[PDB]
Write a protein that binds this DNA or RNA. Structure first.
Length: 849
DNA sequence: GTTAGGGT
């Protein structure tokens, strides 16, 4: 055992701490406690009854309204704004099965509709079952909720389904996503919402009494949330007979879901696309005859295949199939050659190029923009080239979707994003390298890694359809059929790669007290070893007690729309009065960093984050500094200029700004804040005290701690608390910096690509870790008294300061318990406040002089 | 010296 720096405090300070604690310990309307205790007493049968009675609004129908809409539908179908809207609707394949779907829904609880993109199942099946209910004189009994995997799709589909009815939004169709909602009318309505929204709505209505029909869309995509939703329906549908579910899927293992619901009726509806010709790597080299020059394993795959096509393809071509680098995106100048080939032959249309990540996209842009070949220079000024990446500006602009200048061709160099999320309408030709990136968690080593991998059959199939929007197209797949033969069916259901604490905590509010039993009933059962690893985290932050039952803190954490660690972080900042910077920290780690990453400028972006980080040496405080800057730029009417100067997305920041209010309002409604404003001065008296912020940041990111040991940009010798050597990711503002006032760091995500990096970090002090962490004991090991945290880091500490810090952790642990059970804002001159001021004082001993 | 893609 080694010994860190001395953390003993001056005598005058410990004397004040003991006095303030003596005050705290001279202390002697909680509806929350009665709610918490009820949830723990009742069994499931009793839980079912109570949620019935409490959500009984749909047990009521409106006959004067029933009739009026039935009268109004028949009448408004004869206008000359409709009947043209109906006739164009009836060209869609789904509408040809309208009356059978009506019947299959009447005769069965769960049906499934499988149909390719273009079939109109999603805009039409919701309308088909509403208009039927309205005419049958049943209108006010019908409330249809249809989920989507994505926010953007939920709106434009609802704006469209509202246009197909000659209505403004919020009459008979609505949408509701997080923090933004155009709600429909209460009854006789179609509401489009993201799966997350519906899952939060279950806390109040866990047996779906507040809807008559449920449509799950894009189930084949296997989002955690649709995967989760179908398990829960197995628990709900025995207690909800009047409830009608309609699952919806592409032609991607549709049978998994039909099996899953026991052999339910299944409609197949055909699509509306142009046919897109599939070319593979052999057929590409036959048309371009490109030459490459500057484990195998590769040969096991290619020679048995080359033999089956010895007489069907050229001889010089098939020898390049032996080169390991012909497939994938290994040779950019090859991919460079195929675009130039499309630009000359093969008629007019855009080129959408699918590359794995930021690095490979950046390479080809410069090749197409700054070519080394004469054939490249010939073309460069006749192509308008768009890189398409989440961290790049192009998605939030209008150009890439629209047509190029006259005489120039559009070439889109994209990651996996343009497969589902982004849709460019003038694409004819798709170049599919077949390579993508994926995040992998190894349960055994506690390492998340980011790897390039092959894509699956479902993906290529998705990218082929991307070419059939305007006219018949072509898809060039830069891998042979022998690769496709060995590719996976679908991607790993992401629930199998994900941490599970947040679901486990949520499941406790649906009176599903056993996560091992429940998660096994999903289509793909999660690793029970990852289920246990979930509970332990939750037990550690004390959202579950040692028996594993929900605790009063844990109910608050389950009622916040954020992972419990940062949920717990936010709650501390209410009790310690630093609300605004902390909820900036939380929204950022949950959602994402508002900074773009434009091509070439990465060096300049470092300088911007360095200036925004204000030498506070923390990525989380850096974003808050950005958010305070963004607010000032609104106050100056310089917002646009501000965002163009610092590579910032105003869309993100306003959404980051919205999450903070959602955080503040919840905390206020929960009785932890006196004001729902995240900016209010009382909620923020300590928002200027940096050593306090680092201590509340650490309370949430603990126990992901790092220790740094070397100085030289600067070279770093740093290891996480488990012994593995790490670095700051080059994107984090702590990369390369020297002269840290402290050698201890907390981080949210660590990840391996070319090294094991901490993607974000805040510099923290040993005293603050000791007070908010665990694994604390006082002792002697050398001939020195020590103080440790996580039983991992041992700090020189005299006895007088230890017995105060331990006594301080006792009182802190007593305060947090009572606040979870009996939430109220901390009064300014009460007993509770003295213990707070005792911690504020001990943490300011670490202030930068 | 570097960042697949969703969402409450």
């Amino acid at each position: 055992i080694r010994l860190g720096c001395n953390v003993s405090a001056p005598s005058g300070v410990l004397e004040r701490v003991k006095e303030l604690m003596e005050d705290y310990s001279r202390a002697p309307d909680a509806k929350f406690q009665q709610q918490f205790r009820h949830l723990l007493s009742v069994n499931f049968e009793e839980f079912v009854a109570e949620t019935k009675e409490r959500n009984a609004d749909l047990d009521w129908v409106n006959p004067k309204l029933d009739e009026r809409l039935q009268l109004e539908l028949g009448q408004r179908q004869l206008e000359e704004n409709a009947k043209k809207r109906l006739e164009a609707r009836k060209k869609l394949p789904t509408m040809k099965y309208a009356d059978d779907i009506i019947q299959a829904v009447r005769e069965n609880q769960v049906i499934l509709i499988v149909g390719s993109t273009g079939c109109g199942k999603t805009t039409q099946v919701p309308q088909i079952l509403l208009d039927d209910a309205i005419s049958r004189g049943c209108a006010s009994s019908c409330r249809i909720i249809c989920t989507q995997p994505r926010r953007i799709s939920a709106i434009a589909i609802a704006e469209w389904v509202s246009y197909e009815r000659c209505e403004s939004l919020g009459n008979s169709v609505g949408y509701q996503i997080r923090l933004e909602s155009r709600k429909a009318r209460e009854r006789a309505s179609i509401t489009y919402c993201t799966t997350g929204v519906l899952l939060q709505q279950l806390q109040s209505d866990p047996l779906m009494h507040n809807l008559s029909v449920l449509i799950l869309d894009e189930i084949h995509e296997r989002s955690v949330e649709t995967d989760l939703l179908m398990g829960l329906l197995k628990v709900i549908l025995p207690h909800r007979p009047d409830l009608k579910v309609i699952l919806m899927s592409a032609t991607v293992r549709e049978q998994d879901f039909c099996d899953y619901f026991n052999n339910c009726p299944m409609f197949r509806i055909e699509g509306v696309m142009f046919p897109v010709k599939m070319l593979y790597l052999e057929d590409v080299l036959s048309k371009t005859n490109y030459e490459f020059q500057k484990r195998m394993k590769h040969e096991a795959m290619i020679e048995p295949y080359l033999r089956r096509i010895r007489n069907s393809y050229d001889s010089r071509v098939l020898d390049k199939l032996r080169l390991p680098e012909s497939e994938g995106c290994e040779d950019i100048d090859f991919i460079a050659d195929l675009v130039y080939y499309i630009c000359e032959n093969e008629p007019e249309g855009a080129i959408l190029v699918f590359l794995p990540g930021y690095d490979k996209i950046s390479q080809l842009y410069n090749i197409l923009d700054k070519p080394k070949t004469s054939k490249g220079q010939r073309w460069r000024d006749h192509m308008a080239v768009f890189p398409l990446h989440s961290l790049m500006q192009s998605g939030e602009q209008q150009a890439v979707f629209r047509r190029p200048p006259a005489g120039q061709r559009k070439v889109i160099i994209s990651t996996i994003i343009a497969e589902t999320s982004v849709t460019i309408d003038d694409v004819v030709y798709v170049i599919n390298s077949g390579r993508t990136k994926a995040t992998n968690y190894d349960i055994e080593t506690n390492i998340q890694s980011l790897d390039e991998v092959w894509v699956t059959k479902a993906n290529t199939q998705q990218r082929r359809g991307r070419a059939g929007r305007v006219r018949p197209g072509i898809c060039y797949n830069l891998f042979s059929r022998a690769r496709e033969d060995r590719m996976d069916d679908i991607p790993t259901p992401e629930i199998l790669r994900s941490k599970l604490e947040s679901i486990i905590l949520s499941l406790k509010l649906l009176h599903i007290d056993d996560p091992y039993r429940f998660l096994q009933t999903l289509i793909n059962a999660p690793n029970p070893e990852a289920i246990k690893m979930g509970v332990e985290l939750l037990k550690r932050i004390e959202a579950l007690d040692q028996t594993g039952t929900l605790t009063p803190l844990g109910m608050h954490l389950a009622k916040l729309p954020i992972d419990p660690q940062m949920g717990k972080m936010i709650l501390m900042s209410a009790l310690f009065c630093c609300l605004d910077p902390i909820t900036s920290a939380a929204a950022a780690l949950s959602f994402k960093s508002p900074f773009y990453s434009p091509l070439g400028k990465e060096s300049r972006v470092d300088e911007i984050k360095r200036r925004m980080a204000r030498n506070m040496r923390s990525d989380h405080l850096m974003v808050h500094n950005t958010i305070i800057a963004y607010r000032d730029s609104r106050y100056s009417h310089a917002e646009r200029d501000f965002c163009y100067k610092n590579f910032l997305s105003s869309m993100t920041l306003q959404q980051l700004e919205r999450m903070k209010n959602q955080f503040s309002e919840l905390l206020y409604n929960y009785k932890f804040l006196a004001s729902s404003n995240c900016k209010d001065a009382a909620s923020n008296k300590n928002s200027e005290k940096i050593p306090l912020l680092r201590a509340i940041i650490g309370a949430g990111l603990y126990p992901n701690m790092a220790h740094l040991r070397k100085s030289r940009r600067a070279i770093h010798t740093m290891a996480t608390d488990d012994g593995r050597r790490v670095n700051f990711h080059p994107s984090s503002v702590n990369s390369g910096e020297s002269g840290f006032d402290s050698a201890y760091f907390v981080y949210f995500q660590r990840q391996k690509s070319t090294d094991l990096f901490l993607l974000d970090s805040t510099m923290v002090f040993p005293m603050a870790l000791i007070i908010f962490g665990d694994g604390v004991e006082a002792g002697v090991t050398q001939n020195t008294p020590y103080l440790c945290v996580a039983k991992t880091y041992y700090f020189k500490c005299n006895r007088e300061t230890a017995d105060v810090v331990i006594q301080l952790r006792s009182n802190l642990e007593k305060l947090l318990l009572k606040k979870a059970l009996y939430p109220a804002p901390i009064e300014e001159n009460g007993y509770e406040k003295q213990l707070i001021k005792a911690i504020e004082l001990l943490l300011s001993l670490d202030e930068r002089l």
